[PDB]
């Protein structure tokens, strides 16, 4: 849950944060926290279930990290970054999804979707920052 | 230079071929004795060591073994050609051969020999050699013992030969050399069906010397540093010299009367320095060797030059307090002045570099960008074919950041410089006129540095290891400055005989580095096993460090060698050396089971035992096993020294079994026995406190025994109160001991493929970089 | 009967370094944020040279509590405690070259050497008592004879 | 003993102490040596033994 939650946090900050125009320094550490999840998330591969009709899909991390050379961010990094958010998008409101709709009569406080139990590794701790919802 | 003769002068690695069948044991004739003890006239063949020489006290059997163990790992060899040990066997009805000529004595000796049964004689003259020349087979058969033919049997089985083709010799080439198009390769020889190689050992570092073994990666990246330097190509049809300094001062207006810093940009501008900043910078980078920056702050030419260099080289390439000196000259002397900013009061230790600083106080974008460029310039660590490399980025492989540094350079040339003497400005712009002159050629060089640095990185085998080194190679500004001022049009690739060369150098250092990793890790897993907690392992490590060939052991402390032994510890023993030592741990015992040297122990009991019957001892008092008797640890009363136990039972007459690899007497003696000598050999024990002095009498009563009237005139079974524990010679079954050893029955093996290739270039002036543009583009 | 100083377990295994060897490690990773780059580093490879002798460390621990446990064996009178009017001036450098020097050879006192140690001990105390006793039956001797 | 030439050099190479600007170069790693060594093992033992 930390974790995921640490996902979708970092892809809500970089979705406000890089923005055309913006300080590198305004997003220099968001861009390290976004770096660190792809290399954390690059050679996992997931499965989002297909209990009821949500579709089977399978989601696969092999992207390179966001530069960190421009004084002020362009179209061209915002484009860039943008792609490889979707994707991340993409996939945590799938795992999302596909732990709202399961259910556990004897540990229904632990995942019960198989992302996010795999994202409960201690692999994955490296995402987990500002919890703060 | 003698590191480049230590590194260069490594061969890859020695094959070892077998001549003959590697053997612990012989057939041996003895005597053989009826029930009664009387000879008979027919001999019988026994299994016998052939060199019986093992040790007394079982902690120097356990290290006897552990020399067999290396002896076993030197004699196996990397492939076998049994028809090279074929021999005629003189019995065959076919004439046909057997391996090795031991086996070929062996029979000619059974053959002849008159008690030997007319059905072995059958089978000796059936022995004979098959060929399957279709599957390039052969078989043979040879006498061997079950452990010798288990020995022989992996070596056959285990050889380290693989087939060899043009295919394989074309894919021995590094991938990024082979997709390069500047390079054409060629062969003219078919390689045949049997032609072989060996591949070399290319596992990345177990050890990783570049973490904690700080003195010992200083070396390797010295080393490595020698050898790019010995290999990065020497720059053709640089500018002349006089030429370009004429060109410059005429730039610069040399004035004689007034005292100048533009006179200073002259200093240090030769070819010599230009080639040797060219070597320095790219085999820096191939070895990942820390620099360090050598300048004079007076020099202004030598703080644009720093620019460019920390422009497309990256800054953790450089030693932290000359980086930082670096950056503050340049932002002192040319940036803040420039647009009026007061001098920076930069602090000795700071957490930022002064270009860092200066990124976040400087409000012109062009110089500001180039600024945070520098700041985040880095190598990108990328796994290519197996091998980690630092990568440069994409724009200086193109050359493109020269223009955004040309860009900050014309800002700055542009301002007004409010603070300071006219002169001063003359001097920066004079500086940045100097370099900007060179745009093209500026671009062509960070091209050319970019193309020949990634080419060379192809050729590596051994991880890139991104670490500051102990001590860094100094790099002089002027030396930048005259590979700016310099560098004409003419393009420089690596030949590809260079190129394979530094290859195969890179080859055989990571083979040796393996093998002798393999090598240590499978005597220190040995001595471990064998429990030689005595066993002070120093040796082995220095035996490793020695035979890398690189470093002075003389100067390794015994603390860094035994943390080398720890990292060796953990690592896994190769599959040939595990396998030869769980046949060695298989079969110790046995093996020194049959030294006749040597007994297991000695039981004293304190009642009438009959001694054994068989058939090559008669009468002997041997017992095969220690059941029914308390055992004492002989080894374990050696180490403590405390006797009182085994006092305590020898003045009670207390039976006990002594356990141990003990000396002992051979008597044969009827009166000797019936004085009860045996009984007598361990009074001493109590008297001086020692039993390495221990030697029991094992009594062997025959038809040979002068006495033996005895035993035959008063139906009288000869007993003992003391028996040797002791195991009696397996018979020498000859069918039973005939092996059909198998193996290839022909091939060539090869050692340099390479030597298969013949590579050239393409013409310099239309080789391209990555981005399949011409590497260099000036008129 | 007789008080001994002895030491806390963790030395006499030697156990205790491994912690020393942590708390070093950990000062070998640390920033020194205001401090000069090439005197950081030489204090980290300073730490790291000692911490790369742990092994060594703990053996010459364990060497060190042996020596005393076995040679205080022969101690025969109270180990008493007193911060003393003078020192034995130790040299730090003499601990470092005990720390970069020390190998694996064990050396444990001779069973001679303890013996003589001992006796010297016992010939110590026990004159130490015997001149006691004379000088306390002279005095009594004396006051009791009216020698005033 | 470990020798007291590798181990001196060992610590110099480490140390990088010519490279630095200490005021006192040569007095870094001066009473090195076995004979300081076995004085600090006797003083130590012979310290806490009386």
Redesign the interface.
Known sequence: MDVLYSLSKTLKDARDKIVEGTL??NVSDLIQQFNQMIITMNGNEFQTGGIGNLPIRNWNFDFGLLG?????LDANYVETARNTIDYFVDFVDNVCMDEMVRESQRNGIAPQSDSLRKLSGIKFKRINFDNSS | ESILKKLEDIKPEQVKKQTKLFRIFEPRQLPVYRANGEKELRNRWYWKLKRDTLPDGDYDVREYFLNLYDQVLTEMPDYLLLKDMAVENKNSRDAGKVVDSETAAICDAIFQDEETEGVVRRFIAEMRQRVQADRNVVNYPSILHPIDHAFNEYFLQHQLVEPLNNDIIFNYIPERIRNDVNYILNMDRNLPSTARYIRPNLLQDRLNLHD?F??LW?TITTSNYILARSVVPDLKELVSTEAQIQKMSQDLQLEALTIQSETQFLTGINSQAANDCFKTLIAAMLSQRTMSLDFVTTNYMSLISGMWLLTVVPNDMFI??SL?ACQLAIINTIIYPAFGMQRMHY?????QTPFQIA??QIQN?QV??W???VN???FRQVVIDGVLNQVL?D?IRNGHVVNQLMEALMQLSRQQFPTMPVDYKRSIQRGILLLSNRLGQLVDLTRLLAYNYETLMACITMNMQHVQT??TEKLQLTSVTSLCMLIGNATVIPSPQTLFHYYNVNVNFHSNYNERINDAVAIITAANRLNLYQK?MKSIVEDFLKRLQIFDI???????M??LR?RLRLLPVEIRRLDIFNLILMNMEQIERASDKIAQGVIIAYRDMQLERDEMYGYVNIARNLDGFQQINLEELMRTGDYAQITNMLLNNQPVALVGALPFITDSSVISLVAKLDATVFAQIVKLRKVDTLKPILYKINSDSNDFYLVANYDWVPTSTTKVYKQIPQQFDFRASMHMLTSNLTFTVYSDLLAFVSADTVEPINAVAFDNMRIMNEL
């Open positions: 590198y320094s960190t050379t421009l004084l002020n | 904690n700080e003195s200083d932290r307090e930082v602090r000795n230790g700071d957490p990124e976040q974008f500001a960008n600024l945070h460029f985040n310039n880095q980025n724009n102990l001590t002070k003389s100067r390794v402390p015994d603390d860094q035994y943390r720890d």
